[model samples]
Target: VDFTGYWKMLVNENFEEYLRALDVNVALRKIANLLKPDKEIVQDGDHMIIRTLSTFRNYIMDFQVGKEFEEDLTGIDDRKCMTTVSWDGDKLQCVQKGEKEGRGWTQWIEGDELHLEMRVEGVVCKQVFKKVQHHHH
Candidate 1:
């Protein structure tokens, strides 16, 4: 898989501002700012595997390109469902589907850093992911 293994990120300075733009509350924005992501991704041909691991929470997600899935969004994002994630030029694109309609997100990697964008109700949130490479686990 091109995007696989444990990919970690260091929340950059602009991250909080982006979340705030998305209307994320103060408390949530603070925690999210410091939250580090231990992301794991795997792939078997076109099938994809994705996981986000951290002390605060953990999640496992999967999907294939051009296919719709009723994704269960739990934990911090206590949302009902979403048809989230498809591939676009080596990036993962998603549309967060639910009552809070017109919401979506996208994630990709550039060099040693990752780029993330989230949108909700006309507000857009941007994030950068810096992969924390741990050679000796």
Candidate 2:
């Protein structure tokens, strides 16, 4: 799965519950749930850069496959962790080692849709995105 293009968010499930499980404040979680974010991904073999863009705030993650790096969830959860992302068959699997238990996400593409399952504690948030195509005139 070559995720090297822009994607628009289509649906988000259990988002507020997932945020609550991470101990995000009610006010912040409410605001966060109202924002729809787009994703921009750039991949070059083992190296990848993923950007989560929204009207409220933006986050960028740059990492290499199978390599662990320090991740600061500043705008999101205000937490720091050691994160590693690797390929589980065709799916992108991630693990975040931090104060929280079982924190990570998995992303995979199916047809023209991208599916993401984010997890923390026992909460799971599912998000689906559609590929954005530009029409050249």
Candidate 3:
């Protein structure tokens, strides 16, 4: 399964209603949902760079499979941290360091929807993304 495609935020459980589920303000949530979150992902073999784009600001991270990378969880998340990306079957797993300890996220695809699970302080937020259809390129 190739995750090389545009993705649109679909059903976001928990935090969608309040970006402040992590204490983010109303203005940030409005900016995030309305900005057409176009997550541009470029994968070079097992390494990848994921850019979460928005009008408010942009967030990007580059990581290699089976390798640890220092991640700065900025742009809305506002978390200073380090994280590692690894593969679990076909799912992409992120193990993070910082903020609410024992936290991270897991991303995978189910049919045309991309599923993401973020965990922090015993709360799990599930996010769904619809695959964007690309006509060319």
Candidate 4:
């Protein structure tokens, strides 16, 4: 269940549509669609911090497993949300409750690649990431 690694995005599918579901601007969506993002995850027992980085925009989120917290999607949707992350088997399931319906993400690893599914307003975006490095903290 330890998922501490730097991951580089290899493929992104339906990301623009997912951004549209979140009501992202056309200019921003265009920028987002063009760039590949990287994700850095640092996890220690029940606490974890995730960073999604891109040239256009970056997002940072930290949460404790099984603990609910107020999260503001400042760099992404720019909305206040109640978010929680918990373990579902070996994968991490996150639930984000906010203005939009079905806004959440799931993270899991299959073999050598990491998989992420981002959902918003019934649109599901799939992103596959390859492991860049692993760091122990």
Best by lDDT: 2
Ranking by lDDT: 2, 4, 3, 1
Clash count in backbone of candidate 2? 0
lDDT of prediction 1: 0.70
Instruction: Please list all clashing residue pairs in model 4, or write none if there are none.
Output: none
Total clashes for model 4? 0
- What TM-score does model 3 achieve against the real structure? 0.80
Candidate 3 lDDT at 64 equals 81
lDDT of each: 0.70, 0.94, 0.73, 0.88
Per-residue lDDT tens digits for candidate 2, residues 21-135, read 9899999999999999999989999999999888898899999999999999987899999999999999999999999999999999999898999999989999999999862
Model 4 lDDT tens row, 6-93: 9888999999999999888999888779999788989988999998887776788888999999998876767888999989999999
| lDDT tens readout by residue for model 3, 23-111 | 66787776665555566677788878887766666778777887877777566578777778888898998888777566788888899
* 2 against 3, candidate with superior lDDT: 2
By TM-score, rank the candidates, best first: 2, 4, 3, 1
Candidate 4, superposed: residue stretches over 4 Å from native: 134-137
- What clash pairs does model 1 have? none
Worst 10 residues of 1 by lDDT: 73-82
